Amino acid sequence: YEVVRVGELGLIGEIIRLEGDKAVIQVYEETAGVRPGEPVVGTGASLSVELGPGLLTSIYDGIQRPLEVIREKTGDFIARGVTAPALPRDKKWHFIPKAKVGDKVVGGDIIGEVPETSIIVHKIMVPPGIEGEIVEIAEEGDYTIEEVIAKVKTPSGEIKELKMYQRWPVRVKRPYKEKLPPEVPLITGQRVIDTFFPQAKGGTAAIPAPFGSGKTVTQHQLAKWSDAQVVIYIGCGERGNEMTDVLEEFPKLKDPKTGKPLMERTVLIANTSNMPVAAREASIYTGITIAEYFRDMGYDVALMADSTSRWAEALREISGRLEGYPAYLASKLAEFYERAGRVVTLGSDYRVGSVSVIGAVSPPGGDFSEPVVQNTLRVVKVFWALDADLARRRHFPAINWLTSYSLYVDAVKDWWHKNIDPEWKAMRDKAMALLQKESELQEIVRIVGPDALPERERAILLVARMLREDYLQQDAFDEVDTYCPPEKQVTMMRVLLNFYDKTMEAINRGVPLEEIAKLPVREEIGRMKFERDVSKIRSLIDKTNEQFEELFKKYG
Numbered sequence: 001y002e003v004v005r006v007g008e009l010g011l012i013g014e015i016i017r018l019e020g021d022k023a024v025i026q027v028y029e030e031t032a033g034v035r036p037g038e039p040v041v042g043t044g045a046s047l048s049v050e051l052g053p054g055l056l057t058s059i060y061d062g063i064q065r066p067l068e069v070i071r072e073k074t075g076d077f078i079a080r081g082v083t084a085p086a087l088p089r090d091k092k093w094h095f096i097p098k099a100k101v102g103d104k105v106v107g108g109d110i111i112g113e114v115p116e117t118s119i120i121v122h123k124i125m126v127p128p129g130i131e132g133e134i135v136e137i138a139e140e141g142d143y144t145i146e147e148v149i150a151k152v153k154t155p156s157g158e159i160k161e162l163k164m165y166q167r168w169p170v171r172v173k174r175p176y177k178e179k180l181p182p183e184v185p186l187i188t189g190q191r192v193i194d195t196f197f198p199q200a201k202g203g204t205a206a207i208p209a210p211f212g213s214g215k216t217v218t219q220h221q222l223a224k225w226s227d228a229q230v231v232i233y234i235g236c237g238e239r240g241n242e243m244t245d246v247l248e249e250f251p252k253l254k255d256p257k258t259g260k261p262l263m264e265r266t267v268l269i270a271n272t273s274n275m276p277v278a279a280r281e282a283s284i285y286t287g288i289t290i291a292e293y294f295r296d297m298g299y300d301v302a303l304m305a306d307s308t309s310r311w312a313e314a315l316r317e318i319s320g321r322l323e324g325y326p327a328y329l330a331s332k333l334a335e336f337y338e339r340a341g342r343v344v345t346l347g348s349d350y351r352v353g354s355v356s357v358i359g360a361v362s363p364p365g366g367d368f369s370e371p372v373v374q375n376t377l378r379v380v381k382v383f384w385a386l387d388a389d390l391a392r393r394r395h396f397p398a399i400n401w402l403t404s405y406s407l408y409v410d411a412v413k414d415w416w417h418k419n420i421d422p423e424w425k426a427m428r429d430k431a432m433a434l435l436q437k438e439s440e441l442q443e444i445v446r447i448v449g450p451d452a453l454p455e456r457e458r459a460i461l462l463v464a465r466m467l468r469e470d471y472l473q474q475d476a477f478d479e480v481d482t483y484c485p486p487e488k489q490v491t492m493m494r495v496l497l498n499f500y501d502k503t504m505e506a507i508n509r510g511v512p513l514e515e516i517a518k519l520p521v522r523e524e525i526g527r528m529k530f531e532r533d534v535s536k537i538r539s540l541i542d543k544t545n546e547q548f549e550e551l552f553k554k555y556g
Contacts, residue, residue: 002316008063008278013037019047019278021083028171046172049286051293052145052165053114053122054087056230059247059268061275062283063170064290070247077244080275087165092142095124095149095164103134107175108296108346111137111150114164117264119255120230123297124149127166128175128346131155170285174292176343182381182411184342186302186356189225189483190218192399192472195428195493197382197406201228201300202342202354205382209362213386213398219306221397221476222358223266224256225483228302230265232291234283235307237272238362246270256483271310280311288339288355295353296345303340306360312371330375337379382406395473401435421490427497431467434500438464455507462517463500470526471496481529488534495525495540502548511555521547 001012010018010025013035020026023039027046034042049064059067065081072078099111105126111134112124136151143149143164150162168174182200199205209215223231236246246268253262269287271280284305291303314325342354359380361372387400409425416424437460445453453461471492475481484492503516516522521544528537 003277007276008282010040013040019282046169047282048167048169049289050086050165050167051290052087052124052163053093053116054091054145054165055267055290055293056117056120056122056265057263058086059270060086060286061270062279062281062286064286067270077247078272078274079243079247079270080272081279087145089144089146092144093122093164094141095138095143096140097137098124099134099137099150101134101137104132104348105134105152106131106346106348108351109348110297111162112164118260119258119264124164125166125296125347126152126162128168130160130162132160135159168289168293170282170289173339174289174296176296176341176345178344179341180343180352182342182408184415185408185412186300186354187227187486188222189485190221190397191474191484191489191492192397192401193384194484194486195471195489196401196432197384197399197404198408198412199226199356199358199382199406200342200408200411201356202340203356203382203408204337204340204380205356205358205384206376206380207358207360207362207384207386208368209360209386210388211362211364213388213391214396215306215360215362215386217476218384218386218397218399219304219360221482223302223304224253224262226302226356228300228354228356230267230291230294230299230301231262232267232269232287232294232301232303234269234271234287234303234305235310235360236268236270237275237310238306238308243270243272271307273310275310277313277315280307280313283307283311284336288336288357291355292339295343295355298345298351298353300342300354301356303355303357304360305358306362308360308362308372309364312363312365326370326375329371333375334379337376381408395468396476397474399472401432401472402439416486416490420486421494423494424490427490427493430497431471431493434460434464434467455513456504458513459503459507459516462513463496463503466499466522466525467496470529474529478530480532484529485534488537491534491537492528495528495537495544498541499525499544502544506548506551509552509556511551515551519544519547519551 008019010020016029018025018029025040025042031042061081064086066084067079068082069079093114096113098113107126107128107130109126110123111126114122114124116122130152132152132154134150135153138149145165148161149164152160154160182203184201186199186201188194236242251263255262255265267290269283271283287303291301294301340355340357345351345353363372383404385400385403387398390398390400413425441461506516524540531537
């Protein structure tokens, strides 16, 4: 029977995988009445989630139960899911009709709006699989969630009652018209990511995060700055005290785009050591379903996971197929990541939404082993490799620029070219080439020393250092450098690559490198990340050109 008293698992009778509470079984595999077994009843209903006004600001567990006890013993802020309505049946929501009696609707059609928080307008949609005519629609006014707000007559004549919320099975991906090819970058405002290791809207990203590599900071930067309207965050149980910081500090966190509380565009799914192992398995399906629901409205959603240890827990089996553990994890994680994407949503109007997945992978269990690695190597398209040595050298964000990668560079380049700068791809490739040349040089120098370096090679190291310090390094704590707009990124890059071109030109005309290193403009370039006016940054190109001219006219 295994872990039973406070669990959720429901495979003890005859048929395969099922789940429930107090042996009251919900469906994933087909049921056949009162199952031959123990006291077990059955509901016919599936492992599902409730989707409507009430999701935002809320903290749930892996099956969308709101979290209870603040504290009971010396353990402050230790919580689990209490059996209660996922959406407050108590509160009145302001409904605004966007459809009229007589209108033809299909699944995904928006029939009303509800201002949920001061940030997010909740779009009231027709549930998937419901078609027909609005024969009845609520007027503008305040309604609780159970109140019928519209009636639809299907083509059969069957009358369907629509509320402000809908239900969806957590293990079935919410349908859409078309999954669009990766195309539009999810702009993080972090230079090293947007430039060298871009995330696409609808893309899949992992963050390998060894202890003490600035993971929390990076995660926070991504959550608050990425141009997704809604964040679905899964974790808060990786550190023993993580739940306390989340319960105490999360309502204090600000969305810097609006000034309003960040919690007003966020939904939290908490996984902890006290919670049943089954409410941690289903957790990522609960999260992605809720993410899918918001993209169906036309929002870009960021699904962020930082729940490696509590999620990675194992469970024993005896029967024949047990087909392996590294394959039990491989089919599971793939079907999760498979649900990421930018889509043409359901609805009569042309509409687009996305779920971008950013999954933290930080194992305190030794190394990045098979329980995390090459079961994903195909499916995750971007890796931001946090590096403890880089953190020790105080290079922040501590993203290793040699072991990180994105397979979205070619997918997003046209967006950058068309909207921001026609030379974006040429410039990042050039900058990367320089960083890779630097890396090769540093290794040769380690072996043989820097004494016999020619001017040209010294120049390359000089400019690579400027790239690392003036561009790759970014200050999350600074009021200006905490976010770098696309136009600032390309302009800083131009400044730097122009300085490179002029440096190599100068060496090639007999100018000594010491003269180039002491150039006044160099140190202004060192501070351009702190400048908010992009035209002042841009002016450094002409300033660079002119100071190099003075060097040329005194030499040749």
